[PDB]
Amino acid sequence: EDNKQFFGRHRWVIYTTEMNGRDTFWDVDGSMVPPEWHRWLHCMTDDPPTTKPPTARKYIWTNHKFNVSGTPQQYVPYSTTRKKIQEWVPPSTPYK
Protein backbone atom coordinates (compact mmCIF):
# COMPACT_ATOMS: atom_id res chain seq x y z
CA GLU A 1 0.00 0.00 0.00
CA ASP A 2 1.10 3.56 -0.75
CA ASN A 3 -0.99 6.23 0.96
CA LYS A 4 0.00 8.94 -1.54
CA GLN A 5 -1.47 7.41 -4.71
CA PHE A 6 -4.99 7.84 -6.07
CA PHE A 7 -7.92 6.19 -4.30
CA GLY A 8 -7.87 2.98 -6.32
CA ARG A 9 -4.13 2.59 -6.73
CA HIS A 10 -3.19 3.27 -3.09
CA ARG A 11 -3.18 -0.47 -2.31
CA TRP A 12 -2.27 -3.57 -4.28
CA VAL A 13 -1.35 -7.25 -4.07
CA ILE A 14 1.59 -9.34 -5.21
CA TYR A 15 -0.05 -12.74 -5.49
CA THR A 16 1.46 -15.96 -4.22
CA THR A 17 3.75 -18.04 -6.40
CA GLU A 18 1.75 -21.13 -5.39
CA MET A 19 -1.74 -21.69 -3.97
CA ASN A 20 -3.33 -25.11 -3.38
CA GLY A 21 -1.35 -27.05 -5.96
CA ARG A 22 -1.41 -24.75 -8.97
CA ASP A 23 1.86 -22.91 -9.62
CA THR A 24 0.57 -19.37 -10.21
CA PHE A 25 3.91 -17.70 -10.88
CA TRP A 26 3.56 -16.39 -14.42
CA ASP A 27 -0.25 -16.35 -14.58
CA VAL A 28 -2.74 -15.33 -11.90
CA ASP A 29 -6.34 -14.13 -11.57
CA GLY A 30 -8.15 -12.11 -8.94
CA SER A 31 -9.62 -15.17 -7.23
CA MET A 32 -6.75 -15.98 -4.82
CA VAL A 33 -7.58 -13.05 -2.51
CA PRO A 34 -8.68 -14.51 0.85
CA PRO A 35 -11.93 -12.93 2.08
CA GLU A 36 -10.28 -11.33 5.12
CA TRP A 37 -8.13 -9.25 2.76
CA HIS A 38 -10.86 -8.94 0.12
CA ARG A 39 -12.64 -6.08 1.91
CA TRP A 40 -9.37 -4.24 2.46
CA LEU A 41 -8.47 -4.69 -1.21
CA HIS A 42 -11.75 -3.29 -2.56
CA CYS A 43 -11.70 -0.32 -0.15
CA MET A 44 -14.65 -1.75 1.78
CA THR A 45 -12.62 -0.70 4.84
CA ASP A 46 -9.41 1.07 5.81
CA ASP A 47 -8.39 -1.66 8.29
CA PRO A 48 -6.08 -4.47 7.16
CA PRO A 49 -6.85 -7.88 8.69
CA THR A 50 -3.62 -7.68 10.70
CA THR A 51 -4.98 -4.55 12.39
CA LYS A 52 -8.59 -5.83 12.12
CA PRO A 53 -8.77 -9.52 13.07
CA PRO A 54 -11.85 -11.11 11.47
CA THR A 55 -14.19 -12.67 14.01
CA ALA A 56 -13.16 -16.33 14.02
CA ARG A 57 -15.75 -19.11 14.14
CA LYS A 58 -15.77 -22.87 13.65
CA TYR A 59 -17.62 -23.09 10.32
CA ILE A 60 -15.38 -20.68 8.40
CA TRP A 61 -13.04 -22.35 5.93
CA THR A 62 -9.38 -22.57 6.92
CA ASN A 63 -8.25 -22.42 3.27
CA HIS A 64 -9.54 -20.04 0.61
CA LYS A 65 -10.42 -21.63 -2.73
CA PHE A 66 -10.24 -19.81 -6.04
CA ASN A 67 -12.99 -20.38 -8.58
CA VAL A 68 -12.76 -24.10 -9.28
CA SER A 69 -14.66 -23.82 -12.56
CA GLY A 70 -12.97 -25.58 -15.46
CA THR A 71 -10.73 -27.83 -13.39
CA PRO A 72 -12.26 -31.17 -12.29
CA GLN A 73 -12.83 -29.65 -8.85
CA GLN A 74 -15.68 -27.57 -10.31
CA TYR A 75 -19.25 -27.64 -9.00
CA VAL A 76 -21.99 -29.55 -10.80
CA PRO A 77 -25.67 -28.89 -9.99
CA TYR A 78 -27.83 -31.71 -8.71
CA SER A 79 -31.18 -32.09 -6.99
CA THR A 80 -30.66 -31.82 -3.23
CA THR A 81 -34.10 -33.26 -2.45
CA ARG A 82 -35.38 -36.69 -1.48
CA LYS A 83 -37.50 -38.89 -3.75
CA LYS A 84 -41.06 -38.18 -4.91
CA ILE A 85 -43.81 -40.83 -5.14
CA GLN A 86 -42.05 -44.12 -4.40
CA GLU A 87 -42.40 -47.30 -6.43
CA TRP A 88 -44.18 -50.39 -5.16
CA VAL A 89 -41.78 -53.28 -4.57
CA PRO A 90 -42.95 -56.46 -6.35
CA PRO A 91 -43.36 -59.60 -4.24
CA SER A 92 -40.68 -62.28 -4.29
CA THR A 93 -42.83 -65.33 -3.54
CA PRO A 94 -44.03 -67.33 -6.57
CA TYR A 95 -47.18 -66.45 -8.48
CA LYS A 96 -49.13 -69.31 -6.91
Partner: protein, 55 residues
Protein backbone atom coordinates in the same frame (compact mmCIF):
# COMPACT_ATOMS: atom_id res chain seq x y z
CA UNK B 1 -3.40 6.61 -10.54
CA UNK B 2 1.82 14.66 -8.68
CA UNK B 3 4.03 15.33 -11.69
CA UNK B 4 7.11 17.41 -12.53
CA UNK B 5 6.86 21.19 -12.54
CA UNK B 6 8.39 21.26 -16.03
CA UNK B 7 5.56 19.05 -17.28
CA UNK B 8 3.15 20.80 -14.89
CA UNK B 9 3.68 24.12 -16.67
CA UNK B 10 3.53 22.45 -20.09
CA UNK B 11 0.12 20.84 -19.58
CA UNK B 12 -1.34 23.98 -17.99
CA UNK B 13 -0.22 26.21 -20.86
CA UNK B 14 -1.41 23.70 -23.46
CA UNK B 15 -4.70 23.35 -21.56
CA UNK B 16 -4.77 27.12 -20.97
CA UNK B 17 -5.86 26.81 -17.34
CA UNK B 18 -4.73 26.03 -13.79
CA UNK B 19 -5.81 22.40 -13.53
CA UNK B 20 -3.89 21.75 -10.29
CA UNK B 21 -6.83 23.28 -8.42
CA UNK B 22 -8.72 20.07 -9.23
CA UNK B 23 -7.59 17.05 -11.26
CA UNK B 24 -9.68 14.22 -12.67
CA UNK B 25 -7.78 12.15 -10.09
CA UNK B 26 -8.94 11.83 -6.48
CA UNK B 27 -6.33 11.90 -3.72
CA UNK B 28 -6.64 11.62 0.10
CA UNK B 29 -9.46 14.20 0.11
CA UNK B 30 -11.95 11.35 -0.38
CA UNK B 31 -14.38 10.43 2.39
CA UNK B 32 -13.11 7.84 4.86
CA UNK B 33 -14.43 4.31 4.34
CA UNK B 34 -14.71 3.42 8.06
CA UNK B 35 -17.32 5.93 9.16
CA UNK B 36 -18.70 5.67 12.71
CA UNK B 37 -22.04 3.88 13.19
CA UNK B 38 -24.74 6.39 12.24
CA UNK B 39 -27.74 6.72 14.56
CA UNK B 40 -30.55 7.07 12.05
CA UNK B 41 -33.50 9.32 12.96
CA UNK B 42 -37.19 8.43 13.00
CA UNK B 43 -40.29 9.69 11.21
CA UNK B 44 -43.16 11.91 12.34
CA UNK B 45 -45.62 9.21 13.42
CA UNK B 46 -43.28 7.58 15.92
CA UNK B 47 -45.06 8.73 19.08
CA UNK B 48 -46.85 6.14 21.20
CA UNK B 49 -49.96 8.32 21.60
CA UNK B 50 -52.44 9.93 19.20
CA UNK B 51 -50.98 7.79 16.41
CA UNK B 52 -54.31 6.27 15.39
CA UNK B 53 -53.97 4.92 11.86
CA UNK B 54 -57.56 5.99 11.12
CA UNK B 55 -56.49 9.65 11.01
Amino acid sequence: ASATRVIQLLRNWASGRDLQAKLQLRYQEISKRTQPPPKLPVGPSHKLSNNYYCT
